[PDB]
Design a binder for this molecule. Sequence first.
Ligand SMILES: CCn1nc(C)cc1C(=O)Nc1nc2cc(C(N)=O)cc(OC)c2n1C/C=C/Cn1c(NC(=O)c2cc(C)nn2CC)nc2cc(C(N)=O)cc(OCCCN3CCOCC3)c21
Ligand SMILES: CC1(C)C(=O)N(Cc2c(F)cccc2Cl)c2cc(C(=O)NCc3c(F)cc(F)cc3F)ccc21
Ligand SMILES: CC1(C)C(=O)N(Cc2c(F)cccc2Cl)c2cc(C(=O)NCc3c(F)cc(F)cc3F)ccc21
Lengths: 311, 311, 306, 63
Amino acid sequence: SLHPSIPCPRGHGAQKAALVLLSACLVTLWGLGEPPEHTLRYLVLHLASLQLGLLLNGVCSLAEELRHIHSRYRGSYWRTVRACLGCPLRRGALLLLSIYFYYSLPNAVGPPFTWMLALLGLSQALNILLGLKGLAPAEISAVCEKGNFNVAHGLAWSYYIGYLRLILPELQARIRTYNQHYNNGAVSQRLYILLPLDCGVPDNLSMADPNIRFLDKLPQRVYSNSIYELLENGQRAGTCVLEYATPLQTLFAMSQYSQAGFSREDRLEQAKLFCRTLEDILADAPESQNNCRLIAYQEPFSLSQEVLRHL
Amino acid sequence: SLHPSIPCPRGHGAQKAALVLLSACLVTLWGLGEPPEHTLRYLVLHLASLQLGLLLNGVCSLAEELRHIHSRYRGSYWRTVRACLGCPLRRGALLLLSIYFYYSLPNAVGPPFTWMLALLGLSQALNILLGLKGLAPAEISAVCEKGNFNVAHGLAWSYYIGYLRLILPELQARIRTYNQHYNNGAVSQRLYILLPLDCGVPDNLSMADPNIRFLDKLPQRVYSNSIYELLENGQRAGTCVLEYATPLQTLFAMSQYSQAGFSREDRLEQAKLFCRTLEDILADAPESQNNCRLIAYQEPFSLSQEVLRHL
Amino acid sequence: SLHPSIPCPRGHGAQKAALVLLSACLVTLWGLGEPPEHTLRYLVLHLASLQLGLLLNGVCSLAEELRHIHSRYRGSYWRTVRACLGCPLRRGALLLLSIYFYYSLPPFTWMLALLGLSQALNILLGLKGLAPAEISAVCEKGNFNVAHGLAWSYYIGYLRLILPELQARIRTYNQHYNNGAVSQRLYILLPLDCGVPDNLSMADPNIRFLDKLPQRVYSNSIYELLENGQRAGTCVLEYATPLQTLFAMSQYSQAGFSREDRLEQAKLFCRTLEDILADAPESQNNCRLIAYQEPFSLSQEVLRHL
Amino acid sequence: IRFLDKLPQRVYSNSIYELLENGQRAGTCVLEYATPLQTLFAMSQYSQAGFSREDRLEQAKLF
Ligand SMILES: CCn1nc(C)cc1C(=O)Nc1nc2cc(C(N)=O)cc(OC)c2n1C/C=C/Cn1c(NC(=O)c2cc(C)nn2CC)nc2cc(C(N)=O)cc(OCCCN3CCOCC3)c21
Ligand SMILES: CC1(C)C(=O)N(Cc2c(F)cccc2Cl)c2cc(C(=O)NCc3c(F)cc(F)cc3F)ccc21
Ligand SMILES: CC1(C)C(=O)N(Cc2c(F)cccc2Cl)c2cc(C(=O)NCc3c(F)cc(F)cc3F)ccc21
């Protein structure tokens, strides 16, 4: 909620839509007057073949994993099987049930037992080769976000453990010490971090806008925290410790290089993510509680307009 | 592995037994050769009955849970509903499938929908009033240990955060300083925490065994650690910084009191759980890098033998 | 009674719901009007199926627990059987009664095999999941909650050791000081969110540290209770350190202890501290608890408690 | 005379003083005591200086 464009955490609208659809199907089934028993022999058997599809896709997925076992799966075969087939004991019954359900269930439409394995494997291999059963980008982001496999989440936490977690416990003492020597505006006790969404980070801050000008270097294992003041038509409307977010600077440099495999669109994906991750780490943080605030924006307006409203 | 009587975390032998039972049931069902359509329909209707009974039980629970909305569930109806009925959308789908597969599919063994609902309500009411369907202590212990629902977990983590994490770093420096000055054997550089599983903590450590004798208290927020010299057949084989585990004494005192409702069997279970939790925490702790060594013993033997063998 | 948001001990509204459902069931059975022998037979067979399912689940649990026998059951198979199957005699009698009714009332073993397969499926997948409300109810009834242990250890280790001499030390300081006077009660602060700063000034500038109470050694602090810039009260403020421990527990990932878990355990810690200190011999109006949560003026609440 | 601000800056620190007349500012400047005038004073305190009060005032006039 820091910015109109920062993504929201994934809601349950998707499953809520499945409940919408599931009502329609049950109404349709009783609406068509189809024999209820024949309905059950198809939902289970069709899902039985679908669950048998993962076994064949698992073996194809497994054959490559057997060469990483000394390095990736700490030399254990159980981890190798667990990574490709999920929980073994959970999937062990579903395979036996799929075998038993198919081995005996009468089927108005459906191959016999030996004909089942013939057709099922061919589709599994064809999908692998053609990539037809690929991952949609919308669900690639959803799985990565839920699994926290994002370069942004790594940068945000490193930015916290390395830098913010170390200075903030002693920034209040350092700011209180600084204010005890100077008397005017007022130096805010909250650290300020600029978050240009498009990863546009100049090397210095005084080049960003003339309204923000350098004042002094806050006294300090050496942390050069540059305090700045704001200009509101020739008057200091506020002074605060405003700095850039180094990870957002490196994120821009990440996309430029040709060996990073980091697309221009991907940079915007992990630039908005870094702000939200840094929003919620500080919210629960003990040191960064009522001690820091973030300035997130996107230049299409002046920067100094946003800084003042946060003071 | 501190003592043979400290339990290991619950494994997945229950799932293995479930797999064995499923295989045996499948083999028996195939051997007897009953019509598979009957098998499938009966199994589906049984699952439907179980799900609907769970729904009615959850409704009975939610009836009292309506008065807890403002306090225990932060005043939102949907959180209360999820707490009573589990996953809202998943349970909705399962119950809709149960409703369809009962109101449409036939059932030789099973009432009509209204009379089935009456019977199910009666059974749920009886199971709630008489508590006939209840959790055996094994499931309760398993759920508590998986979800960390134990007083021992709290005592162990409090012991780590409050006391151990604030002395283990400086204890090595204190021991080195005390060894540099007093050249009168040698002092071990690790604190040897005692964990009496019987929860018998006397005021004097020398009264546990005459061989353990109070030699000195190590010089120093005010932590007083007493080092004890160890007599092997009347000869001092050495010395080490030794002390009891206060949370075990507090556990015994809790057991004595009449408001804890914390019996001797429960006291022993939580004592062993606390010892295991402390072992795990100290093993994974970054501060305790070979800085402390737990000595868990149960009186069935001289403590001097065990402490020396660890020295 | 401690605070509006503190969860009350679980009441018997569930039994009210059970009575309502029982009345509705009796009314509808009377209305439909079917031979009651068939209803009784179906009910008894349903109970027998439930008992057989419990037997299968207990057998699986026992197959799990057989390897814990030398640490959880003193090497006695009887304790393992009782743990996995409830009360031994009662459960055995129930099982034989259910099996006898199963054999008596009008496939015989095929039904049992199907029931066993269904039980195995429920064990593996987990459709017979434990609702979080019922988990909390069982934990509170049996007192397996972390907050229970934390509060009881806080009582045995810290509160019970200093309350009997706190009033004497306060009186000594009262002779040492003169006109205001410090109250003879300990005011333990219990922030529900468990966010405790190191010093009260950071939490609230309206509260000023005054002095340390005279003195294992125990150090306590007396705080100025400023109001409108004037001194309005003096009482001993001391954060409940177990709440700080709970926050640190929720911080680390090895605790398996979520944020809502921390909040609920904070509420239970406050409520069971109320229960301990309500009837304790060492609590004779020399200790008063403060519980609040910022949606704030702590000093206003403390003065209201004075 | 009240301390108002420190002039921005080897390393030196100077103060600007709010010259108040009738409770209102009449002017501003940078005031700075002569630090030797302390050293001449702290000689007179010490018995090793051989530098008495009559000499302290007499010399501080020359300085
Ligand atoms: C069992 C009590 N309890 N249950 C819960 C839940 C919370 C507390 C609790 O907090 N009690 C507490 N709070 C105090 C505050 C002050 C003060 N003036 O501030 C002084 C006190 O008395 C000295 C305080 N006490 C009592 C003694 C406390 C700490 N302590 C412990 N703790 C445990 O064993 C234990 C058991 C469980 C379970 N969890 N823990 C860890 C918390 N072992 C010790 C052994 C030695 C020794 N052999 O030398 C010296 C100790 O004290 C020096 C530390 C002083 N520090 C402590 C905190 O920070 C500020 C001051 C020891
Ligand atoms: C949901 C519904 C009605 C449906 O739409 N189909 C698609 C479909 C066919 F597959 C086959 C014919 C018609 C339709 Cl119409 C389906 C299939 C089954 C089934 O049992 N398939 C066995 C099976 C295969 F047919 C091919 C294979 F490679 C493996 C395999 F294991 C059950 C229910 C359905
Ligand atoms: C696995 C098998 C054969 C089995 O063992 N039972 C237990 C049982 C009874 F519950 C009821 C009668 C006989 C048996 Cl024998 C069962 C039940 C159904 C079923 O559809 N039950 C609906 C249903 C009821 F019948 C009564 C009720 F109060 C609620 C309710 F929701 C299907 C298959 C089985």
